[PDB]
């Protein structure tokens, strides 16, 4: 809507935004993140992971 500048998810976080210079709507997605897991056999057996 012309009055609304931001947009929020169900869990109260910003997901859409309106550009001030040009009246455009942009979906904001957080940058990728994850957990790093290391698969390895015993160190005595080998040193490859």
């Amino acid at each position: 809507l012309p009055f609304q500048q931001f947009g929020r998810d169900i869990a109260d976080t910003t997901d859409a935004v309106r550009d001030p210079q040009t009246l455009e709507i942009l979906d904001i997605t957080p940058c990728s993140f994850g957990g790093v897991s290391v698969i390895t056999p015993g160190t005595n057996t080998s040193n490859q992971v």
Partner: protein, 49 residues
């Protein structure tokens, strides 16, 4: 988006269904014998008797 992750189960639903199908086939074709050793076939009416 805020650092919470959900990890997939080790056994997919297909593998669970396969396990249940194996159990059902074993209990149909061999009665209770396959649960305590080698599977021995028997006609179903005799198992019901």
């Amino acid at each position: 988006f805020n650092g919470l992750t959900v990890l997939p189960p080790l056994l997919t639903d297909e593998m669970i269904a396969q396990y249940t199908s194996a159990l059902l086939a074993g209990t149909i074709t061999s009665g209770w014998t396959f649960g305590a050793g080698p599977a021995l076939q028997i006609p179903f009416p005799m198992q019901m008797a």
